Amino acid sequence: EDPQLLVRVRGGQLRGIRLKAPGGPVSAFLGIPFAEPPVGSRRFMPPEPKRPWSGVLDATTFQNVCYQYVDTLYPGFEGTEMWNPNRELSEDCLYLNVWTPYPRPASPTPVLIWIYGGGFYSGAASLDVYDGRFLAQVEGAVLVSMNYRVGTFGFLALPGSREAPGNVGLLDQRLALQWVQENIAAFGGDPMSVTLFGESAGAASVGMHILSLPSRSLFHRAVLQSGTPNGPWATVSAGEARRRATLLARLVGCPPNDTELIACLRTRPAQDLVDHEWHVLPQESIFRFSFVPVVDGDFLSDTPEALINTGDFQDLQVLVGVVKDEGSAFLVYGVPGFSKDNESLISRAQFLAGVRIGVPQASDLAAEAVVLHYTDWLHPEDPTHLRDAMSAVVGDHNVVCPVAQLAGRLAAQGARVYAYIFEHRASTLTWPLWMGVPHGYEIEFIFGLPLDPSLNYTTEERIFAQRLMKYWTNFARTGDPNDPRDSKSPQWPPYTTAAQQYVSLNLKPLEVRRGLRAQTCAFWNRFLPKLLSATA
């Protein structure tokens, strides 16, 4: 028995496993239960703390993936399969993982907590791209990641009911955060320096913890990559979650009031619920997800828009950013004319039609406005332009402009904000060239995977990943991503509403740019709401 691999937490003893990182050993504790299995009558319910266990709990393997839809568009293609469950599906999935340095840190170390994405309908903390091994080994970080319930299991809501109050997957995350406060010191983590970070839905989740008072005492800094709590896909109104839950129930034969409806849903096999998950969306669309956090008046006291507009963010530090082609990869999930297996050169007609699908809530006038803005009037019918514009429309509406308004609002209201745009395309990428640097493809680099020589990343990419791991952990450590030794430029400046400085993350040294897609986001954040607003 290795004494470094034995830990006592509140609930009992645990045995981890020494894993190999290229620079040396790390201690990993995988599959640690943080809640009572949310099964049977606990489906749709807020999670309860895990009861104490006897003996030594085996924490050497990843635990089950939360029940979710599995992608079937491109079977056995790396670019999709890399996001698919890599363990057994089960409703019994409330476990987290901890990577620490080996030997365990001598003095308390800043803690990073990862929250995965997947549109609140998918994801898992066990995917190879979320491997905490590298960050633990090179930067000496204590890295934590939890599973949280997704799809119906995490977010089906009958608002105001006792037995489907909504947002429970966000409560799973909050419970993992509390678990960290109570327990991370036993691993040599510092519960007094916790940085949340996440991508896509994970980034929106981090956003939600910023916006929810009970979460605030559980972290000190935040990183939101390619996602925000504001914007068109991350939340729904109470009225709208009730409609979808009700509709899903109708779809699976329930009922033959809220209590009855939820009791009958509870009798249904998990796959029955996933079978009809997609059919509750109000419009033909892309970048919209059936079961997401609901504006409940509880976890979320008002809309994320109202909350960001009026919040006090004085002692908060935030790192936010986007990748170069946020919307490209989404296009093949519903826009006629797009495929990964050809160059996807579209007609003008295919563009107008794709806009109604990229901006599913847009009126004729509003979609006309989108079209007229994104057209290159010098080359109005050029298929390459039209394709890139369609991708641009989706990236901007869903990620880049929501990010830009989050950054401005936080900065204006006392927070310390650092922003980036990530522009390096992975040499190993399996999606076609026209998709560029798609949603999700920075993660790989932040987590330090290019340092594994067996993964065939170029030398330049390894150095690049070393730089990114240093920014992220510098940020966790201090709230400032800059290397406090060196001494030479260019320094990453804070983002502000005046100057609007952000940096390009790519193979070249940091470049400072101003204005995060400024004219275009003004279109989305200031004009379009007004459209659309008073009419209709």
Q: Which residues are part of the catalytic machinery? A: 200, 326, 439
Q: Write the DSSP assignment of 237-268 as a string of letters.
A: EHHHHHHHHHHHHHHTT----HHHHHHHHHTS
Burial 146-155 (b: 16+ CB within 10 A, else e): bbbbbbbbbb
State the residue for tokens 């459209």: 531
- Determine if 82 is a binding residue for ligand NAG (CB under 6 A): no
CB of residue 144 vs a copy of itself: minimum separation in angstroms? Answer: 39
DSSP 400-459: IHHHHHHHHHHHHTT-EEEEEEE-PPPTT--S-GGG-SBTTTTHHHHTTGGG-GGG---H
CA distance 33 to 24: 28
Task: Pick the binder of a copy of itself from 181, 361, 500, 506 (CB under 8 A).
Answer: 500
Stretch that binds ligand NAG, among 212-220, 337-345, 355-363, 445-453 (CB under 6 A): 337-345
**3-state percent helix, strand, coil for the chain, nearest multiple of 5:** 40, 20, 45
Q: Binding marks (x or -) toward ligand TZ4, 473..502, rule CB under 6 A? A: ------------------------------
Which stretch, 66-74, 225-233, 244-252, 373-381, contacts a copy of itself (CB under 8 A)?
A: 373-381
- Pick one of ligand NAG, a copy of itself, ligand TZ4, none as the site partner of residue 337 (Cβ within 5 to 8 A by kind): ligand NAG
- Only one of the segments 69-77, 254-262, 460-468, 494-502 lies at the binding site for ligand TZ4 (rule: CB under 6 A); that segment is 69-77
- Listed ranges 85-93, 104-112, 118-126, 393-401: which one lies at the site for ligand TZ4 (CB under 6 A): 118-126
Residues 139 and 131 sit within 8 Å (Cβ to Cβ): no
| 351 near a copy of itself (CB under 8 A) | no
**Which entry of a copy of itself, ligand NAG, ligand TZ4, none binds 521, CB below 5 to 8 A by partner kind?**
a copy of itself
Indicate whether 330 belongs to the interface with ligand TZ4 (CB under 6 A). yes
Length of the chain: 536
Sorted by sequence, the CB contacts under 8 Å of residue 485 that are 6+ apart come out as none
For a copy of itself, the closer CB: 372 or 433 = 372
Does 80 bind ligand TZ4 (CB under 6 A)? Our answer is yes
* Cβ neighbours, 10 Å, residue 10: 11
| Cβ(101)–Cβ(34) below 8 Å | no
Q: Does 427 bind ligand NAG (CB under 6 A)?
A: no
Determine if 337 is a binding residue for ligand NAG (CB under 6 A).
yes
CA 480 to chain centre: 22
- The answer to the question of residue 403 lying near a copy of itself (CB under 8 A) is no
Q: Which does 339 bind (CB under 5 to 8 A by kind): ligand NAG, ligand TZ4, a copy of itself, none?
A: ligand NAG
CA angle 40, 45, 48 (to 5 degrees): 90
Rule CB under 6 A: is residue 343 a binding residue for ligand NAG?
yes
Which of ligand TZ4, a copy of itself, ligand NAG, none lies near 526, with the C-beta cut-off 5 to 8 A by kind? a copy of itself
Kindly tell me which residue out of 89, 345, 512, 522 binds ligand NAG, with binding defined by CB under 6 A. 345
Which one of ligand TZ4, ligand NAG, a copy of itself, none interacts with residue 200, CB within 5 to 8 A by kind? ligand TZ4
Strands 56-58 and 12-15: parallel
Query: CA–CA separation, 418 vs 423, rounded Å?
Result: 17
| DSSP-derived secondary structure letter, 162 | S
304, 354, 358, 438: residue in contact with ligand TZ4 (rule CB under 6 A): 438
Which residues contact ligand TZ4 by CB under 6 A? Answer: 69, 71, 73, 80, 83, 117-119, 121, 199-200, 277-278, 289-290, 329-330, 333-334, 438-440
